[PDB]
Amino acid sequence: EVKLVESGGGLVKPGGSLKLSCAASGFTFTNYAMSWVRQTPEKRLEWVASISSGHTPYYPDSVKGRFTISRDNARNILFLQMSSLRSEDTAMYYCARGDYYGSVYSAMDYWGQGTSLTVS
Amino acid sequence: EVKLVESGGGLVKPGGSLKLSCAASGFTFTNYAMSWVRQTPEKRLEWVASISSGHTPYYPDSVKGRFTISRDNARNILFLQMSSLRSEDTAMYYCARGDYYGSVYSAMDYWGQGTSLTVS
Amino acid sequence: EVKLVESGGGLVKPGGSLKLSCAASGFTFTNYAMSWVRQTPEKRLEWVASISSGHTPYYPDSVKGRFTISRDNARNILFLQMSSLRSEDTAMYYCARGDYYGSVYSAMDYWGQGTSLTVS
Amino acid sequence: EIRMTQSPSSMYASLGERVTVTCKASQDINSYLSWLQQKPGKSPKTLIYRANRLFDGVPSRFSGSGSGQDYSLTISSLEYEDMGIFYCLQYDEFPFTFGSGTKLELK
Amino acid sequence: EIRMTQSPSSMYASLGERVTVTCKASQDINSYLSWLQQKPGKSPKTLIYRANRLFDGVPSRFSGSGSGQDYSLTISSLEYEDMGIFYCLQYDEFPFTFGSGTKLELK
Amino acid sequence: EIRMTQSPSSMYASLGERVTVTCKASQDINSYLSWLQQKPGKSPKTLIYRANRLFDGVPSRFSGSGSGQDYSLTISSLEYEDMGIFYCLQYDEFPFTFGSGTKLELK
Amino acid sequence: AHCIGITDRDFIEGVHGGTWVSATLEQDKCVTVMAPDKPSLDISLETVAIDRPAEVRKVCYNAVLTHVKINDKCPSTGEAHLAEENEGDNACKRTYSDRGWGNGCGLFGKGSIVACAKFTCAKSMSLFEVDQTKIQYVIRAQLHVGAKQENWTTDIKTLKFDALSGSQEVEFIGYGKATLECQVQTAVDFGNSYIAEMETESWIVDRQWAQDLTLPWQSGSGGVWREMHHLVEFEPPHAATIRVLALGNQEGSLKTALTGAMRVTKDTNDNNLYKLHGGHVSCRVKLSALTLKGTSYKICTDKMFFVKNPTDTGHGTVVMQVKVSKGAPCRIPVIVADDLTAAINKGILVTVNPIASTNDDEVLIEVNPPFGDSYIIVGRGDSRLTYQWHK
Amino acid sequence: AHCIGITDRDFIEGVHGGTWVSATLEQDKCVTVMAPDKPSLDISLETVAIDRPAEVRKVCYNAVLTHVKINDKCPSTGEAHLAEENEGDNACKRTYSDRGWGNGCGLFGKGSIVACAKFTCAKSMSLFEVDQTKIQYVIRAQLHVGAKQENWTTDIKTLKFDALSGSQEVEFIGYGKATLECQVQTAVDFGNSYIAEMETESWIVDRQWAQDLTLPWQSGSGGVWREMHHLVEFEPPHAATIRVLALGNQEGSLKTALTGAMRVTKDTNDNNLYKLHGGHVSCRVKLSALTLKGTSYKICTDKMFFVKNPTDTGHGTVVMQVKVSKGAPCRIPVIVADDLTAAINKGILVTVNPIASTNDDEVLIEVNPPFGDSYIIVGRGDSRLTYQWHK
Amino acid sequence: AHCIGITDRDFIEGVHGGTWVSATLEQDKCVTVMAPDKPSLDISLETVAIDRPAEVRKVCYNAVLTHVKINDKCPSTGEAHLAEENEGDNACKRTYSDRGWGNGCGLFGKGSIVACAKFTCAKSMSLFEVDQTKIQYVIRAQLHVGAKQENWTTDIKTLKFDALSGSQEVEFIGYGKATLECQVQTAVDFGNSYIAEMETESWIVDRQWAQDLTLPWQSGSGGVWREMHHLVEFEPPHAATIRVLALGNQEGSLKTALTGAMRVTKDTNDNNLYKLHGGHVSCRVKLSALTLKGTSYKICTDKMFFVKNPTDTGHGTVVMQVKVSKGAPCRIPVIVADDLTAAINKGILVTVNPIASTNDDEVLIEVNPPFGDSYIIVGRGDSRLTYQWHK
Ligand SMILES: *[C@@H]1O[C@H](CO)[C@@H](O)[C@H](O)[C@H]1NC(C)=O
Ligand SMILES: *[C@@H]1O[C@H](CO)[C@@H](O)[C@H](O)[C@H]1NC(C)=O
Ligand SMILES: *[C@@H]1O[C@H](CO)[C@@H](O)[C@H](O)[C@H]1NC(C)=O
């Protein structure tokens, strides 16, 4: 009974910093792996981050160093923390759920309800 | 012939405490186990407590730590002490005698005249 | 593209005997199992016999000892031999091919044109 | 954690009738079972315990049977002193429990 | 000798309809189950060789799924060229056996 | 980086229709490819996860197809519940990519 | 016939006349008996078998402890008893615990405790007695004049024996008659033993081992189990409470120990049969009424050829198979020579006098060529056909 | 109070000036510490507890086999191979075998056979690793000032210790405060080991031992069992058939092998914690902050009656229950003496100043008389009570 | 002139009783045979041939890896797994490896990692097993009657031998008959081995070698490779990253190792029939029924010309070719002698009685002179031809 929940969108000035949080239930959270995906105002899609079971991260060059992913087994919470936001960073964002073996190498089975983020 | 006699019920204020006292005669009181049961005009019967010939107590979880049972082998009196009475606990009460092994696990074949305890 | 050809049908007296024959084309024949099935005017199918890439048979007890199956890989041919034919055996018959490996344990791929045998 | 429950919650009868009651249990009771009667405004009394056994002084007209999760009590002929509430009582696990019981009436 | 059975004996259908044949088995056959089709005047044709495995050139409208001792063969939209006779065929045990066979007609 | 393109930018379709959106890739991925649907204002949904494999509970009207660098999604019969956006997701190498989605609308 | 296919073999050679000839047989192997003028004869076992065994014991090897009851008594007033202990199908143990004022009793002496539990078996090994008069043997025989091997399943003859049966008469149609005498006085011992079954894997076992198992056991139908005190264990007491534990399935231990004995099985068809491995038997045979067929026929003249080349097999004989195009009902001469130039034979035929009946017919032949190298030769005149061969 | 009923007890005395005292604790025992003018303490050890361990392996001790398959190839060509061997749910084995003309092969010699079957587990042991950083100790203590046993559960205090905290500042009404320091993580052996669960039964053993069990095992989720052969046995092949059989349950053998280790248990009724049997710890205690409630009360003066006669204990010390008739709240004198003239006191009280709280309530007094016979005396003046005693 | 042309000629002579003569043949060698009354013969081995052997193994010696997948887990859990491991096309390797705060996971120690890739094959060595009864030997035979070079490829006879035809007749028009006896099935020694190919270059090798090369292999059609480790070498890991390194293509190492095997040619102009070098055979020949043609014809009398002059050819024999001018079929006498008085023919002739059929024929003549000085003389009387020679 998968449940997956957003929190923390809004507006931030260029050169600020921010973090977002998601909560989930219905499965033992340490046996799965997680991803973050963004949808532009033009409705194009871009993958931004994922993290394996364990704690190893991966990123594309679109993001490298500017913002970062982490996970807490204690709270069943996923976090995304951002710095030096640019104008292109305004989008809809969703967290998404990995697969039973915990490698990032899989298709993705469920999607959060998501939030916008805005810049001026 | 066996006889059974009842006393000590009445009316008391919530948060109070009282001890009931059953008196019995006509049988070798050292041997048989005995137990307490309570009833309401709402037909559901409730088991209260039970005691071994070895004085070992037994209680249901809803009253653990609240009710206490004890006995006197010279006076042939059964004492049931009740503390922190509640609107949760208002009924007709009965006392009854088990079988000659004095083990707790058996039905009961003699029953007292009974009396009420109530809370206001 | 593959084909199977299938011959020897006709009429036989009860208690008589007959050999049916089949030949194969379009594929290498030493590395497939083969089998026989029957069809009847009640339209209910039955399995008749099968042979491994090992020269070993299997039979159902409904006809065990009456028939024999064998291959001849020097000619890419099957021989199906029956003795003491009985009225129930009057049928349409088909040969068929197994799959890449020598076992009989598989589903079955391609089917003969059919030939008829009649008992009277 | 034992549930026992009873089907004929409002059945009533008339003089000399054959009458039967029955109960189901959430797990095997292994025959540590019994049957009791409540008369209005008086002390309850026993009838039967275990596998269809009678205590002394119980009249012979009472009977029953059961096993596993399924049990029954029945009377060979109903008589007016039988008016009251039947109850079932089980005692194989230390949280002892009764059924809800049912009332029998003459028409 | 294991026995196996199909729900529709003979059944009418409409063009473009979705149609399903349930099959039930007397034991768990571990998905060694296959489905064959025939049309009159011709030798049979194989379509399904394991549950949701297809031969080359099978029309994509065929599918079939299940586990254990119950299975389903399914079609999303009937086509007149595809209509005819269907058979299920298990192949786990030492004695191989077909199902009943089932018949379909376009009303 | 693996580039892909969904060839039909948009299509107009009706109930009962077959629709066959196709995609082409810059590399022969090992079929690590999946199809996503989104309905306006809702969270997206995943249907086909390996190149022809389908989640639990999802309706049977879809199937996938292709090999190497050529693939397509077929809906065997379109229904009102499924108009909207499709996206073609590949996951073979570290830079994941979605191509550009395409619109299917009831005509 | 089939004695060419069996893996391990020996010959045995008689002496001229109506003398008895003697053999010994082990379940997998076979023997072919030879005598100077007679056609040759092959025999084999097929099985020992048992029927209508008798039940003697059930031994229990997994159990469950479904319900428990306990109660206590104060150290002044002696022993205790509980209503359950009266009933025969229940575990019981009695012991002394601590007690004192911290537990509501008048003195600090050692108390008394009783415990009881509802025992039952869940899987049982069943033991059977074998009635030694009832064992059966079945024997296969074939006269080795030979035919294409597909005929073997219909030509082969099968025989039954028991301790009451004496010598046994047999026929071979067109060749005469023979007689066997398997001494049922010869067997491994089935006294002092039982047959053990657990779940369609089964064993011969010595009675002492069966008696020595400390597992719980039962005398027959119904009854109550005898020694649960070996299988159920109680942990040392707490003040008014005890716990009791199973030792689980013992199965693997028992399964390990039985590896020291012959294996046994039950058949799927005519399921009354029990089928048994590992014994051996001895028999004597009478050959006098056997005869060589076809001696009056002409020698063949026409051309002929192999349908299968001669080939090796592990016994040391070769085998080969032949057909005849248009010959009469006639005999085929076959022989081996150290040089193709000379007729002086050195080898031995093991099928003695070949016959072909008709143009459709075929024959199967085996010989033992001399160690060294040689030519096999078949036919005479221009038809003469040959093959080169080695040790 | 608490200590009096336990099977075994230590007395320890601190000479004035030893402001730190130390003592050792075991699960089944307790200690009373005593200091010359301070009310006495009982220290007692309930349990060692563990919370939410780490899951690391599944080990299978029984297996069931099904859907057998087999395949066969002749001596002259290839080797045995079969599609089912790929899917991880199967066990597999491969061998050469006998073959020959009795079957169909063209040449005599060894052929090859392959066989495999589906495998599934019925009952599996789970292994866990443990967080040394999260073990918990639970200790019970209370002051010994006289109080009737029927109230002890409300007067006991309970403490929790772990790697986070040293002594609590333990508080009591009237009497003052105290401190207990614990040597956390001084168990005989911990780490290097796994907790094990069977069905509702448990064990602990070193992490090296489990590697040497030849039972099949799985690591983590989503894998499949490895080293798989050792539960499954194959008979030697017959001509085209192999019979495959399980060694059945190993459970009883496994349960045999662990008997030298410490027992363990779950209890779900206490919210899924694990509790460890048979441990021990060492601690240090400071008494100095305690005070005596009674010191300012008057001496008693009046008639008094026993509620229980004195009685013996396994500790060699006496217990009695006393009640005061009409007096003020007061203190009751106690002495033990050789002569009823009581010129001297030969012995010591366990509770250093008994208090009569108020009329119509009970008191405990507990006393350690010398070797040899002597008199106990309670009360004073002509009403004084007496009871003779012997060693 | 094949007996002349091939270089390592040997000579054999036999007693004129028709006693057996025997020789060993080897592909580089030729043997010519003589007995004094009868015209001389040569037997020479052409080739050993094998037809359509059995395909057993494909062995892959160069390979490429197209994808990498990796997964990792911290010291908590022990080995993880990755879903791709159940697709048999993939190779795998695993290890425990370091982790820490530098890479996010929360405890020091060893975690574990797994890596996979799919496999595929570039070039594949094939192994086949020879089939004994499909061997053929072939032998060339010629009589030294001395026809022109232009006629050799039509006069030559091309015999075949195999186990089914252990001896054979050669028939020569006007010269009678002779017989050859081969020994073709010398032993089982030509077994024990596989015939192996890469692309048009090919070898024979012992099975005991082929079974133990570490390269990956698979048997028969379809399938997926096994023992797959040895082409896929994994880098010692860092920080949950691994370079999967394809080991180098082995080909040249393998081809170098084979050097001691004899060579094979997959000639597929001759119906894919395999040709084998290095053959080795032994044989008997019977000379009895050879005869001499034309012996009583006229002695040749008119003028003659040399057409290829008398020439050395290294075997010590000298060779010449001559044309007759006129007349009938005739016989040409030859002697080689000390002195032109021609008192005795000193040497030996390898053509016994050369003749011509018509005056526009030509003939070869060749002789072995005595050691040292001699005249060679042809014809009789007037218009003889003569020549001079040494050793
Ligand atoms: C037995 O062999 C003969 C040939 O000798 C053959 O004609 C006959 O059919 C065979 N037996 C049977 C039952 O077919
Ligand atoms: C025991 O508990 C009762 C609770 O009402 C209290 O009145 C009494 O003073 C207590 N006595 C002691 C000695 O703790
Ligand atoms: C050689 O071959 C030629 C071919 O024309 C033929 O004329 C001639 O007679 C042959 N001579 C011999 C000796 O075979």
Numbering used by the authors:
A (entry chain H), B (entry chain D), C (entry chain F): 1 to 120
D (entry chain E), E (entry chain G), F (entry chain I): 1 to 107
G (entry chain A), H (entry chain B), I (entry chain C): 1 to 391
Could you share sentences copied from the article?
Yellow fever virus (YFV) is a re-emerging flavivirus that causes severe hepatic disease and mortality in humans. Crystallographic studies have resolved the structure of the YFV E protein and shown that its domain architecture is similar to related flaviviruses, with three N-terminal ectodomains, known as domains I (DI), II (DII) and III (DIII) and a stem anchor region known as the transmembrane domain (TM). Here we use a chimeric virus platform to resolve the first high resolution cryo-EM structures of YFV. Stark differences in particle morphology and homogeneity are observed between vaccine and virulent strains of YFV, and these are found to have significant implications on antibody recognition and neutralisation.
The cryo-EM structure of bYFV17D displays the typical flavivirus architecture of 180 E proteins arranged as rafts of three head-to-tail dimers that form a herringbone-like pattern on the surface of the icosahedral virions. To further explore the structural differences between vaccine and virulent strains of YFV, bYFV17D and bYFVES504 were independently complexed with 5A and 2C9 Fabs at 4 °C and imaged using cryo-EM. The cryo-EM maps of bYFV17D:5A and bYFV17D:2C9 show Fabs occupying all 180 sites on the virion surface. Next, we carried out symmetry expansion in cisTEM2 to obtain a 4 Å reconstruction of the bYFV17D asymmetric unit (ASU) complexed with Fab 2C9. This 4 Å cryo-EM map of bYFV17D:2C9 was used to build an atomic model of the ASU. Consistent with prior escape mutant data, this model identified seven residues (H67, K69, D72, C74, N86, E-87 and R99) in E-DII that contribute to 2C9 binding. Next, the cryo-EM structure of bYFV17D was compared with the X-ray crystal structure of YFV17D. As expected, the crystal structure lacks the native E-protein curvature, however the structures are highly similar overall, with an all atom RMSD of 1.2 Å (average from rigid fit of individual domains).
